[PDB]
Amino acid sequence: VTATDYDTFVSERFGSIIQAVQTFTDSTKPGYAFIAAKPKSGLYLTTVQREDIKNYLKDYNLAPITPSIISPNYLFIKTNLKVTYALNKLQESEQWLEGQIIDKIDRYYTEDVEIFNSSFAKSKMLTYVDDADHSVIGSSATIQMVREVQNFYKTPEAGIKYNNQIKDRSMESNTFSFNSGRKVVNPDTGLEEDVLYDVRIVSTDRDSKGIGKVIIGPFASGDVTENENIQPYTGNDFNKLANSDGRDKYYVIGEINYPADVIYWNIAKINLTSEKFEVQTIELYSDPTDDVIFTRDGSLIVFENDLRPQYLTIDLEPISQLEHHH
Amino acid sequence: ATDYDTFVSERFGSIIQAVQTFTDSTKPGYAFIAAKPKSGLYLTTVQREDIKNYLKDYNLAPITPSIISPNYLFIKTNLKVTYALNKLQESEQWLEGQIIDKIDRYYTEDVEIFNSSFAKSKMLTYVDDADHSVIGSSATIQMVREVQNFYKTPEAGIKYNNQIKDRSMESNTFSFNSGRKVVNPDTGLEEDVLYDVRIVSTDRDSKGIGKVIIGPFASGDVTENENIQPYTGNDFNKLANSDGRDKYYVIGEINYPADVIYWNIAKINLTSEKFEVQTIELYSDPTDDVIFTRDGSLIVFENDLRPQYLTIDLEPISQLEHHH
């Protein structure tokens, strides 16, 4: 028993295609012993869905509790890097240089951060970035935590957490398409099926107890049917998106507990069927109050640029030389 | 029992002196381990959280065994030892000490153990054994179950694992708070009159059942509607008064032969609020002079901490026209 004993158990019987193990138990889900497992190479163990996470299932000793071999709950860092260097000090291209900083940004992660109950610090990685040339003068960054959400429709039973604290309104997802039942025409073309607009999930400033709503919109006046319950969110209090289509009526569908660090929603709370949504998986961005981001139970801060390039933009800036004369 | 108790009995043998597991027919799913500190009576909630946190050590995710303190059965002993003047060197105060040790040495060795039992005949031979001058003893016992909540018996019941006599079951006294004002300038302008009260049992019926009734009231401060009306039987023990109080009422009932005791004050519209206690003690005379333990019950002599459950009368003898 004991998660620690189990972590080993697997750092042996598998200690081949596995880099790390976190055996934690969830207080919401009794009798279930959860086993986080980093593939040591990629991200998901049998993304093929078990091929692997079923083999470990097939390891049994004692107890009335049952294993649930999962892939680690990944925290991502959407970094907007802005390194600046000296035109002259540089001998190879900006292209070769990028491939030089991300070689470092990786060295940091995989040595200090990509570990269980281990953490990430922006200041500490920007030291690694700075440390890629004779110049390279300095560097800026703007990060957000990312949680990848399977089934956009609704969060888990027990909500999703970051293992970190975010700021008011900080929480927002990427946009996805909502197929309004309605139909419209332009450019000599026809019905064009059903009108679609870009819609998304955002949080609101916390109330006097640490608790804002999780709202979704915009909409039409519209494509969502209003009840005694279902009513457009009452007031400004968050981040609205570009109505290049003019729209705006958002609806409440959950809440963030900022202090408790839990976020729940369920689109079924209004009456939209997942059919009315193109997507399956979405991204949930928030920006921390943390100058240090903590991983934790089954959570793991990882940097996989190749397979997750989207989570890193590098904007370089070249600089004129100074005094060359003496 | 020992399947898991023993282990625990290894990593903690320096405190726990008694460990046994059991289930509750009823609290299905739950497995409890009673443990008695070698060092007294109740393990401390820190001693308890440590011991529970070896449950993780041995991996089990299911809610896993509740550790808890043993269900104690106490013997209120009323001892009498008659001894020879000539042959007794030290003080009477010494002699007592000398025997009150023997009692404990018998309890520790033959009694304080799970499902082991107390035999009044044995411990008396221990008493006899305490000095070369302790000519002969006698002894009168009662059973004490220490009740966690006075207001209602457990869902299931309270049992002694032993046969008691009629009218025998009787708790001690606890203040009931009527609600009237007294108007006394001695202590201000208002005391809130509160008179003692106990909970006794009455005589077996045709069929083996008694009624668990509750001490004296003053008509008014208990509301009676047809159904809930004063008990009338005189088949129980009433208590010492100075007040005009003779109205006892009926809650639960004793099943003498199956020894189960259920009661619930609620059966008379009286909230816990109304009584200034939270814990009580239930006494009762055994049928026999050999008394038993069963599931998670443990019999124990902890006399520097429950001194109220032993009294010693000595009788010094010489020669002799008289020893009472």
Short mmCIF file of C-alpha atoms in Angstrom, two decimals, chain A residues 178-184 191-196:
data_model
loop_
_atom_site.label_atom_id
_atom_site.label_comp_id
_atom_site.label_asym_id
_atom_site.label_seq_id
_atom_site.Cartn_x
_atom_site.Cartn_y
_atom_site.Cartn_z
CA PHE A 178 -21.47 27.57 -31.93
CA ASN A 179 -23.87 26.51 -34.67
CA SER A 180 -26.94 28.68 -34.18
CA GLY A 181 -29.86 26.81 -35.72
CA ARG A 182 -30.65 29.81 -37.94
CA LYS A 183 -29.81 30.46 -41.59
CA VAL A 184 -28.63 33.46 -43.62
CA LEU A 191 -28.80 29.51 -47.19
CA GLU A 192 -25.24 28.57 -46.21
CA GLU A 193 -26.50 26.13 -43.58
CA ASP A 194 -26.70 27.56 -40.06
CA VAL A 195 -25.22 30.87 -38.93
CA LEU A 196 -22.05 30.34 -36.83
#
